C-alpha cells in the first residue's frame, strides 16, 4: 500500500526512514511486523512507525 505522513519522523540513525508530514510513504513489506513497516519515500528506504503515517 501507500500512506500520507501525518507527523514528521526525524531519524538519528541512518536505517530508520526519515520523512516529513505530507510525504507519500509507499510500503514495500509490512508483512513482517505491525510496529515498524519497511517502506520507500522516493529517494531512500527504511523503517517507519505505524503511528506516524495515515495507514488507515
Amino acid at each position: 500500500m501507500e500512506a500520507i505522513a501525518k507527523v514528521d519522523f526525524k531519524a538519528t540513525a541512518d536505517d530508520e526512514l526519515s520523512f516529513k508530514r505530507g510525504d507519500i510513504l509507499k510500503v514495500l513489506n509490512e508483512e513482517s511486523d505491525q510496529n515498524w513497516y519497511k517502506a520507500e519515500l522516493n529517494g531512500k528506504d527504511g523503517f517507519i512507525p505505524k503511528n506516524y503515517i495515515e495507514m488507515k
Binding site: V7, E16, P49
Partner: peptide
C-alpha cells in the same frame, strides 16, 4: 499525548 515510537525489537 504525542504520537509514540514503537521499540525496534531484538
Amino acid at each position: 499525548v504525542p504520537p509514540p515510537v514503537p521499540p525496534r525489537r531484538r
